[PDB]
DNA sequence: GTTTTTTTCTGTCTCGTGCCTGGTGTCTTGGGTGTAATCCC
DNA sequence: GGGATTACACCCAAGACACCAGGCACGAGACAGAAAAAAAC
DNA sequence: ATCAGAATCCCGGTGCCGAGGCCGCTCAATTGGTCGTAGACAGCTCTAGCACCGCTTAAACGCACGTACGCGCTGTCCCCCGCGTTTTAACCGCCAAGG
């Protein structure tokens, strides 16, 4: 039996933080793992440009900011750098 | 063949896009367009099921064909 | 007795953008993609599910392009579509040369 | 998990992994995948928190697709973000031009 | 003397536009909006005369295609003045909102 | 400031004329102005977030045509 | 023949093309007959839209290629039309469209 | 930094030989053969994500090939590709 | 207005070379498919 | 009944080094070419 | 306006079914340890981006003025809405005669 992939536990945690009393549809679940799937996708596209406009082939953070900025609108994309650099703190300053 | 189109069907399409009053034409144009559009569809999902060397189209084939002209559908693995 | 025109039909525009079920029902759908898929290959086998997808995309396809159409008669200073509307919304996206 | 040890909910590793088999660069930072983890976390929580303000509008429990469809619809933003995007039992606006409304 | 009724003046000058070649818009000012622009997200900022160029081009590319398909509206219009709502429904089917 | 009216209607007029339009409203040109306005402002931050992680504070024609790519609206001639 | 060029009758270099994929991070690992047959791919497209412009260039007494000649030879393809939609070339313009609600009749 | 000049000149010798070109129309040329080159081989990189291939062979481009362009060109180039595929094997 | 038909003066382009750098010949070895058996849905 | 899994085969790319004539930058002189301006329709 | 009456909304009701809890696995994240060069950084050099101005001139601006498409209106004529009537795509229940 091979072993197959879903992104439905993490952002099933994630929707019981921020509503408890909430439930959901199972192909609203896909929906949102496939929803992953493109963000991500994009994303890295972006990144793999950043790379060949920038001939180099290191991946750190700061490229992947950049690359939200690009890709995002303003306002959600600065709540969202916010937020990953605060986590970047928090992850870094500790081990 | 391509006469499975009803009109009350097209007329349903007319709906959900809240489309009020309806000429005559607009039947067979419909029909016409429809075709073309799931020729270039169906067309490059029968590529991509050629290089796969298999004899069924993967639903996952029809959604990166949609990728490939551009209209990323969620929903079904993609 | 008879009813005045028009308003059964934006009655049922107010029903119609509720349920998303699919509008256009399976068999003769599925024959219809058959058919053109006929011409390819020989024969090629099908999941349902894809058709499900083929059939998700084409009816929300068909329905933007309609509100894009509706709108251009609007413009028009009319009310009924016309084949013609279709062309020129077509001419804008750029399906068409 | 480092996940755990950056205090958030999407597995690093995981990613890491997935990073390294796209071909997405030859190597492959420390954190950058915890920062992109970050970014995805916050964007399902906008995205499915109006959601949830869309299920407390209809009053349902369980999330059906049309609310998704109706709260990228309605925030402006998120609909420029996804405007090519379309999804199974999605529908549209419920919207009327009252120039075709009757008189 | 040979004031001339209208006709040959507008056609003559689309005949000799698309005999052209090259731009319409002259240099300076756009640059200088494109500079008051620029001053906008990070001040400071040096740039190449291609660059500028690029985005000239790119930008009386982008308002022909809006008049033209503005152009068909007006035509389905029935008319030859053309109005904003026009541009709106132009833009408006393009999704460039 | 008010470069913004530093566009003219002559050259609103020659734009239409390769255009092909034939008819020229009076309500146009501010419209005209604020669209192409909108376009040049979503172009330009996407040129400068692209030279903003490239370390130098000048941008290059590249720049534009990378950024141009990435909305889709993608032009040749300067390579890229 | 040394040359894969000369080994191919083509005008292209190969291993150019193969660097280029493996300075790409496209694939981890690549065939011997893939670059050979991408770069035929392109030589074809070269010369077939370059025979457009010789007759497009040819048109107006000029020896040489200039990009309105181009943008005329995409243009009047409808292959290559509906290729270069979303696509503009630097110098183009766009073709002559005069409507017949136009000419003083 | 190598553009493609020469092999176009060689081309163009080989289509249309009493033609001249000016420089910026072999630019938008070389902008041209670059963003090709960089649709199918980024296209040819998906057939391997989407089809866990872990390298490419030339099959792979030929159904690349198809899923860009459209038929008359998709045939002729495939014929194009099958010759050099042949003419090299050969040798 | 269109367009054609003379010089002219004229900008680019093709020839012309030298420097050089990537392109080429080939073994080992290995993993990456090639293909075939088989379950299996 | 064909696709999914696996396994044994085989076989030539990766590299690693050794040998190399082309590839391009720079110039030159020529050579296709835009316009000046008669000059018809 | 205004009543009658279609059309729709909306409230128990029950049922059934899949969302979600749950639970025992095992394989990739981890943990730790070992080379290594990519890049963060220091610093050199010459280009080019910038600013400024003088001279030239063609290009914009304002207005004079007719004028003619845009538009509000009109009549008209026709052909889709819709409701009714069969009616046939579709999926269920019976005659064939051959085995």
């Known amino acids: ?95 | 063949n391509i006469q499975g189109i009803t009109k009350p069907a097209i007329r349903r399409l007319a709906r959900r896009g809240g489309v009020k009053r309806i000429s005559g034409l607009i039947y067979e144009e419909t029909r016409g367009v429809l075709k073309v559009f799931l020729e270039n569809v169906i067309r490059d999902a029968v590529t991509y099921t050629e290089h796969a060397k298999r004899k069924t189209v993967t639903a996952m084939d029809v959604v990166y064909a949609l990728k490939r002209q551009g209209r990323t559908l969620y929903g079904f693995g993609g | 007795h008879r009813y005045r025109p028009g308003t059964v039909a934006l009655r049922e525009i107010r029903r119609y953008q509720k349920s998303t079920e699919l509008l256009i029902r399976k068999l003769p759908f599925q024959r219809l993609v058959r058919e053109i898929a006929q011409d390819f290959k020989t024969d090629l086998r099908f999941q349902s599910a894809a058709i499900g997808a083929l059939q998700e995309a084409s009816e929300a396809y068909l329905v933007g392009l309609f509100e894009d159409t509706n709108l251009c008669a609007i413009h028009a200073k009319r009310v009924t579509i016309m084949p013609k509307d279709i062309q020129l919304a077509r001419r804008i996206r750029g399906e068409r040369a | 998990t480092r996940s755990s040890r950056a205090g958030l909910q999407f597995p690093v590793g995981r990613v890491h992994r997935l990073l390294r088999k796209g071909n997405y660069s030859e190597r492959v930072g420390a954190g950058a995948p915890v920062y992109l983890a970050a970014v995805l976390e916050y964007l399902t929580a906008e995205i499915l928190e109006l959601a949830g303000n869309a299920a407390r509008d209809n009053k349902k429990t369980r999330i059906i697709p049309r609310h998704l469809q109706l709260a990228i619809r309605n925030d402006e933003e998120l609909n420029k973000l996804l405007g090519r995007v379309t999804i199974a039992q999605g529908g549209v606006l419920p919207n009327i031009q009252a120039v075709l409304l009757p008189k």
Do not use: C, W
């Open chain 1, 1 to 95: 039996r091979s072993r197959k992939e879903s992104y439905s536990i993490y952002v099933y945690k994630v929707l019981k933080q921020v509503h408890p009393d909430t439930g959901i549809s199972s192909k609203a679940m896909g929906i949102m793992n496939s929803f992953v799937n493109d963000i991500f996708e994009r994303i890295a596209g972006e990144a793999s440009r950043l790379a060949h406009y920038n001939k180099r082939s290191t991946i750190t953070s700061r490229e992947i900011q950049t690359a939200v900025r690009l890709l995002l609108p303003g306002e959600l994309a600065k709540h969202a750098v916010s937020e990953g650099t605060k986590a970047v703190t928090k992850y870094t300053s500790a081990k």
